Design a protein around this ligand. Structure first.
Ligand SMILES: *[C@@H]1O[C@H](CO)[C@@H](O[C@@H]2O[C@H](CO)[C@@H](O[C@@H]3O[C@H](CO[C@H]4O[C@H](CO)[C@@H](O)[C@H](O)[C@@H]4O)[C@@H](O)[C@H](O[C@H]4O[C@H](CO)[C@@H](O)[C@H](O)[C@@H]4O[C@H]4O[C@H](CO)[C@@H](O)[C@H](O)[C@@H]4O[C@H]4O[C@H](CO)[C@@H](O)[C@H](O)[C@@H]4O)[C@@H]3O)[C@H](O)[C@H]2NC(C)=O)[C@H](O)[C@H]1NC(C)=O
Ligand SMILES: *[C@@H]1O[C@H](CO)[C@@H](O[C@@H]2O[C@H](CO)[C@@H](O[C@@H]3O[C@H](CO)[C@@H](O)[C@H](O[C@H]4O[C@H](CO)[C@@H](O)[C@H](O)[C@@H]4O[C@H]4O[C@H](CO)[C@@H](O)[C@H](O)[C@@H]4O)[C@@H]3O)[C@H](O)[C@H]2NC(C)=O)[C@H](O)[C@H]1NC(C)=O
Ligand SMILES: *[C@@H]1O[C@H](CO)[C@@H](O[C@@H]2O[C@H](CO)[C@@H](O[C@@H]3O[C@H](CO)[C@@H](O)[C@H](O[C@H]4O[C@H](CO)[C@@H](O)[C@H](O)[C@@H]4O)[C@@H]3O)[C@H](O)[C@H]2NC(C)=O)[C@H](O)[C@H]1NC(C)=O
Ligand SMILES: *[C@@H]1O[C@H](CO)[C@@H](O[C@@H]2O[C@H](CO)[C@@H](O[C@@H]3O[C@H](CO)[C@@H](O)[C@H](O[C@H]4O[C@H](CO)[C@@H](O)[C@H](O)[C@@H]4O)[C@@H]3O)[C@H](O)[C@H]2NC(C)=O)[C@H](O)[C@H]1NC(C)=O
Ligand SMILES: *[C@@H]1O[C@H](CO)[C@@H](O[C@@H]2O[C@H](CO)[C@@H](O)[C@H](O)[C@H]2NC(C)=O)[C@H](O)[C@H]1NC(C)=O
Ligand SMILES: *[C@@H]1O[C@H](CO)[C@@H](O[C@@H]2O[C@H](CO)[C@@H](O)[C@H](O)[C@H]2NC(C)=O)[C@H](O)[C@H]1NC(C)=O
Ligand SMILES: *[C@@H]1O[C@H](CO)[C@@H](O[C@@H]2O[C@H](CO)[C@@H](O)[C@H](O)[C@H]2NC(C)=O)[C@H](O)[C@H]1NC(C)=O
Ligand SMILES: *[C@@H]1O[C@H](CO)[C@@H](O[C@@H]2O[C@H](CO)[C@@H](O)[C@H](O)[C@H]2NC(C)=O)[C@H](O)[C@H]1NC(C)=O
Ligand SMILES: *[C@@H]1O[C@H](CO)[C@@H](O)[C@H](O)[C@H]1NC(C)=O
Ligand SMILES: *[C@@H]1O[C@H](CO)[C@@H](O)[C@H](O)[C@H]1NC(C)=O
Ligand SMILES: *[C@@H]1O[C@H](CO)[C@@H](O)[C@H](O)[C@H]1NC(C)=O
Ligand SMILES: *[C@@H]1O[C@H](CO)[C@@H](O)[C@H](O)[C@H]1NC(C)=O
Ligand SMILES: *[C@@H]1O[C@H](CO)[C@@H](O)[C@H](O)[C@H]1NC(C)=O
Ligand SMILES: *[C@@H]1O[C@H](CO)[C@@H](O)[C@H](O)[C@H]1NC(C)=O
Ligand SMILES: *[C@@H]1O[C@H](CO)[C@@H](O)[C@H](O)[C@H]1NC(C)=O
Ligand SMILES: *[C@@H]1O[C@H](CO)[C@@H](O)[C@H](O)[C@H]1NC(C)=O
Ligand SMILES: *[C@@H]1O[C@H](CO)[C@@H](O)[C@H](O)[C@H]1NC(C)=O
Ligand SMILES: *[C@@H]1O[C@H](CO)[C@@H](O)[C@H](O)[C@H]1NC(C)=O
Lengths: 122, 442, 122, 122, 48
């Protein structure tokens, strides 16, 4: 089923994760208008900037090398993906998103590329 | 035999599109209305890229670059008027006499009160007006004071038109037709692309087009409905005729302060002879040019038909005359000498009379008028006549006669004369095409 | 040969496809100017947005999983690539570009990532 | 150590190359402000445009097929990476950056994709 | 909090006299002055 833009905002995180292209399409597409259009491309380029420094520019989903610290959330796979919505999840993980983003650029991409130079050095 | 779609980014594909262009001109040393404080400097070298094999349809009459330029000139005019002195108090009754020793000839010497810099105190001063600017009820008034308010052009700004490049933003492009015999709309076989047009001079003109670009090979006739008379006729010459326009009168200017900071510059009494402004055109060259135009004209009206030329006979004073600007002054030339001919089957330079007006409403602008400040000294500008604007008298009986009158109904036609070759398109760089390729299987 | 920006607009689609970098360079590089510059980056980011949802962000050409429905065009490889220009091609495929783009994000990328999650799930 | 934005501007090129994410983060994040914000995203998208035509969109470092012409600089690995700063390096390679960028899009990416079409053609 | 980041080993040439921040600030103060005058009362009749 295609339910539309934000159609699975109230479904489980697993069900919503299947229709990421739906939210992705409309996510990009006088003075008031112009200032609004600039703000829009500015926010879009910010998120694409974060995907860049996480090595995930061209993909909607990518896996990482950062382990899940249990202090963040004590839930499991079944409890996260089949019982919760992305909204209430983002609220539960609102104390770590900054922290997790910092570990996300540093722990892997800030060491994936150094090892890449030391590896392709022969 | 299994075909799969493949994405191509950056394909040579475009569609007709209307977008907001912008100005561009090389930096010079002041303060002319068009360049303003700043207009982006041109690239040292433009890259005009020929497009082999490419045939695109052009329409100069449905072109939006024309409408954009039209609104730009209008808006620029108003942007230049705001900071200057508005002559609202100059609508006082004028006590005027004719010059007094006029043997065969109009301009009138007037006296009037004026507010000084102190509100309470007054001054009686006198000024000289060309009698087009005033009307009576000897008592007079300015022509404009019942129609609209008025503002005085700043003395510093110059009305000397400079080449302006129209540029399209990145992701869009301009197509340029280089077809010599290009008849005004249609498919252009030889087309090249540019990001910016060549230097287009915004020459404000009526009837005859001045200081423009000349058509190569034959002179070119561009219309929108040739059998229709209501739509004007654009002519581009191959050989430019030379026209020398002078105001011989020694105009002296004085400066009277009418309020705090405000300062009106008025036409002082003339020193020396009283001669009327005029324009000369070599009769030989103008007869050759007129010959060549009717040669290309008869291509559309069958072959020995009677083609005569008559004067303008319709509309207001500001439209019937060859109006333009020269050195600062606005000339209204009567063009009866040129268009008084009939065609079938010494130097002797023609002379054209020109009157001068200092209060003007160009482009059919009703509202805030401008007072052209008087220009000190004798004026002489040499200009080219590169195009023409004609009009028929009506449904003609068809192979019986063909009478032509010059017109200048609308000012956009002047932009069409130089924007006939350019067209705006948007690049669609996404093309999908099938190949026998599949992505790596999951 | 390098013929320049849009140099092969009037060549065959195969010949033009070799110089995609040429069109790609100049494709990105007061009030009127500013509004124009915003419109330019807006259109560029739209196309990059479409390449994103098609999984082709960093490439000029990419192959797909969508088969060519013969109702779209009945031509073959030789007839398409050695007899037609991209212009007249885009005109012939102007009834399907919306349709093909929808199948392009859904048929593959909306199922490439689901299968990617079910595959990297071990 | 994390020294911050531009922290290793005065270190050796090798040491600075380890903290490219640091310069990358802050590199993207009324009329005067608006015109400035547009200029910022315009410059950022220009560099991302160049990384695009070099086939390096999602990476901070990528290797090329262009050989190092010795006329550009006569230094070696040790002399470049352990004795010079990126600043004085960019000054030494300021006569070739245009030239090297042209070879960078043409020598490889303008031939990597043609060979890619001729290779995936079966 | 602003983050003032020291740059070790870095030596850059400064020119306070050829600086454009000065010219920008100069035009900004002037323009701001005029923006503040527009809505207020103009004393044109006070020249009695
Ligand atoms: C088709 O194309 C042709 C070719 O371009 C056009 O023909 C040209 O038309 C031009 C403008 O119409 C005209 O330019 C004028 O020439 C005058 C004479 O030039 C002589 O001096 C210059 C050096 O300055 C020499 O290089 C040249 O060879 C000549 O010897 C100039 O005097 C004109 O400048 C004045 O007018 C313009 C407005 O047009 C002002 O912006 C400018 O500041 C000048 O005005 C000051 O000087 C006059 C002098 O009488 C004063 O009356 C006036 O108040 C100004 O004085 C104030 O400002 C000064 C300076 O700041 C200050 O010191 C003083 O105290 C005052 O405050 C102008 O440059 C071309 O000559 C002519 N080309 C040829 C070859 O003849 C033709 O127009 C085009 N067709 C159409 C329809 O446009
Ligand atoms: C602000 O003031 C200015 C100047 O003071 C005004 O500009 C003048 O406007 C007047 C009228 O608006 C205009 O006078 C007419 O000019 C026409 C064109 O030249 C004439 O054809 C016309 O003559 C007819 O009317 C006369 C009476 O006024 C009759 O005596 C005369 O016989 C004419 O009448 C014949 O024609 C009509 C129409 O076919 C017909 O119905 C009759 O039966 C008869 O056969 C006027 O003289 C001036 O020409 C304008 N002046 C200039 C210098 O251009 C401006 O209009 C005012 N502003 C506003 C907003 O009104
Ligand atoms: C256009 O009209 C304006 C009106 O403002 C006009 O300006 C004035 O012209 C008159 C012409 O009579 C000038 O008056 C003269 O002034 C001189 C110098 O002060 C006097 O010597 C003159 O007197 C002689 O002429 C009289 C004529 O009746 C004799 O009776 C007498 O005995 C003298 O012989 C005369 O009064 C006046 O000065 C100017 N005003 C200003 C402010 O300059 C202008 O001249 C007119 N245009 C033209 C071309 O004439
Ligand atoms: C339009 O009319 C005006 C009149 O208002 C006219 O202006 C006059 O022009 C002449 C120049 O042709 C000016 O005369 C000069 O003025 C300067 C400054 O005062 C003097 O230095 C000059 O002196 C030289 O010439 C003398 C000749 O005897 C020498 O003896 C002397 O050593 C110098 O070499 C000269 O007198 C006159 O001042 C102006 N008048 C005004 C009021 O401005 C103008 O010429 C006319 N316009 C045109 C285009 O002709
Ligand atoms: C310029 O001349 C061309 C002829 O090549 C005109 O094009 C034809 O116009 C007629 C109507 O006048 C159409 O029915 C034809 O379809 C056109 N022919 C072609 C080959 O396109 C064009 O109309 C002329 N332009 C003007 C303004 O008169
Ligand atoms: C007016 O026309 C004359 C020719 O009658 C133009 O003079 C020529 O200008 C071109 C530049 O466009 C030069 O290459 C020629 O050498 C000039 N001709 C001669 C005989 O020297 C003049 O430029 C035109 N004026 C304009 C367009 O303002
Ligand atoms: C317009 O003015 C120009 C220049 O003032 C005139 O050109 C002169 O023409 C005669 C021959 O007719 C020559 O003897 C002169 O040498 C020319 N002058 C220059 C400076 O070259 C031109 O003839 C005038 N046009 C008209 C219609 O009178
Ligand atoms: C331009 O000049 C011509 C002269 O050729 C003027 O035409 C005359 O106009 C009157 C009526 O106003 C007629 O009775 C005459 O027969 C015309 N003269 C000729 C020789 O035919 C014309 O009026 C002038 N135009 C303007 C606006 O002043
Ligand atoms: C996990 O969180 C705890 C907070 O108690 C912290 O002390 C620890 O360093 C974190 N572990 C990792 C591996 O980041
Ligand atoms: C976030 O932090 C605040 C204070 O440190 C705390 O009250 C709140 O419960 C935290 N959020 C979560 C989800 O634990
Ligand atoms: C100037 O104003 C006075 C009234 O004080 C009037 O008598 C005189 O006629 C006015 N000047 C002119 C030239 O009409
Ligand atoms: C334009 O010319 C055609 C040719 O016959 C004619 O039928 C049509 O009525 C004309 N259009 C107008 C607006 O006069
Ligand atoms: C009109 O004259 C031209 C040029 O001589 C010629 O080509 C054309 O055939 C003539 N037209 C007719 C209808 O005779
Ligand atoms: C101009 O028209 C008038 C009026 O018919 C005529 O007398 C005169 O000869 C014409 N001039 C020329 C040069 O044909
Ligand atoms: C191809 O197009 C036809 C239109 O007749 C449509 O019925 C069919 O579903 C399409 N096939 C595929 C596989 O999309
Ligand atoms: C696009 O659709 C319209 C109407 O459905 C049709 O007239 C046109 O021929 C179609 N285009 C193509 C290339 O078949
Ligand atoms: C290297 O630079 C030299 C300049 O002397 C030039 O002649 C040569 O073609 C360049 N070599 C390559 C492989 O680009
Ligand atoms: C760049 O070129 C100029 C002139 O060609 C030359 O003076 C300068 O030394 C060159 N730069 C380098 C680093 O060689």
């Amino acid at each position: 089923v295609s339910l539309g833009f934000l159609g699975a905002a109230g479904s489980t995180m697993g069900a919503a994760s299947m229709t990421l292209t739906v939210q992705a399409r409309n996510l990009l597409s006088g003075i008031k208008q112009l200032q609004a259009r600039v703000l829009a491309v500015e926010h879009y380029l910010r998120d694409q900037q974060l995907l860049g420094i996480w090595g995930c520019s061209g993909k909607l989903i990518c896996c990482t090398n950062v382990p899940w610290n249990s202090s963040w959330s004590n839930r499991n796979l079944s409890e996260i993906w089949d019982n919760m919505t992305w909204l209430q999840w983002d609220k539960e993980i609102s104390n770590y998103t900054q922290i997790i983003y910092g570990l996300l650029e540093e722990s892997q991409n800030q060491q994936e590329k150094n090892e890449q130079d030391l590896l392709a050095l022969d | 035999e299994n075909l799969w779609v493949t994405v191509y980014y950056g394909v040579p594909v475009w569609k007709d599109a209307e977008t907001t262009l912008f100005c561009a001109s090389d930096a010079k040393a002041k303060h002319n209305v068009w360049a303003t404080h700043a207009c982006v400097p041109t690239d040292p070298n433009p890259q005009e890229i020929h497009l082999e094999n490419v045939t695109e349809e052009f329409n100069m009459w449905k072109n939006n670059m024309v409408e954009q330029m039209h609104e730009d000139i209008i808006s620029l005019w108003d942007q230049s008027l705001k900071p200057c002195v508005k002559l609202t108090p100059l609508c006082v009754t004028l006590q005027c006499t004719n010059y007094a020793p006029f043997l065969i000839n109009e301009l009138k010497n007037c006296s009037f009160n004026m507010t000084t810099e102190l509100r309470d105190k007054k001054q009686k001063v006198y000024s000289l007006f060309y009698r087009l600017d005033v009307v009576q009820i000897k008592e007079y008034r300015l022509i404009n004071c019942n129609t609209s308010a008025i503002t005085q052009a700043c003395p510093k700004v110059s009305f000397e038109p400079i080449p302006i490049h129209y540029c399209a933003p990145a992701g869009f492009a301009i197509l340029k037709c280089k077809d010599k015999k290009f008849n005004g709309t249609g498919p252009c076989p030889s087309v090249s692309t540019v990001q910016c047009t060549h230097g287009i001079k915004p020459v404000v003109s009526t009837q005859l087009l001045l200081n423009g670009s000349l058509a190569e090979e034959e002179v070119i006739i561009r219309s929108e409905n040739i059998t229709n008379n209501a739509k004007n006729i654009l002519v581009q010459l191959n050989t430019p005729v030379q026209i020398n326009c002078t105001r011989p009168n020694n105009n002296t200017v004085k400066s009277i302060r009418i309020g705090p900071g405000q300062a009106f510059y008025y036409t002082g009494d003339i020193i020396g002879d009283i001669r009327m402004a005029h324009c000369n055109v070599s009769k030989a060259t103008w007869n050759e040019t007129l010959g060549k135009v009717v040669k290309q004209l008869r291509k559309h009206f069958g072959n020995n038909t009677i083609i005569r030329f008559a004067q303008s006979s319709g509309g207001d004073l500001e439209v019937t005359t060859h109006s333009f600007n020269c050195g600062g002054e606005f000339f209204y030339c009567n063009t009866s000498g040129l268009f008084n001919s009939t065609w079938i089957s010494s130097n002797d330079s023609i002379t054209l009379p020109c009157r001068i007006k200092q209060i003007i409403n160009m482009w059919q602008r009703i509202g805030q008028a401008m007072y052209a400040p008087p220009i000190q000294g004798v004026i002489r500008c040499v200009s080219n006549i590169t195009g023409l604007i004609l009009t028929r008298d009506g449904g003609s009986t068809n192979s019986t006669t063909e009478t032509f009158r010059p017109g200048g109904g609308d000012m956009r036609d002047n932009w069409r004369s130089e924007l006939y070759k350019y067209k705006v398109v948007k690049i669609e760089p996404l093309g999908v095409a099938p190949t026998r390729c599949k992505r790596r299987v999951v």
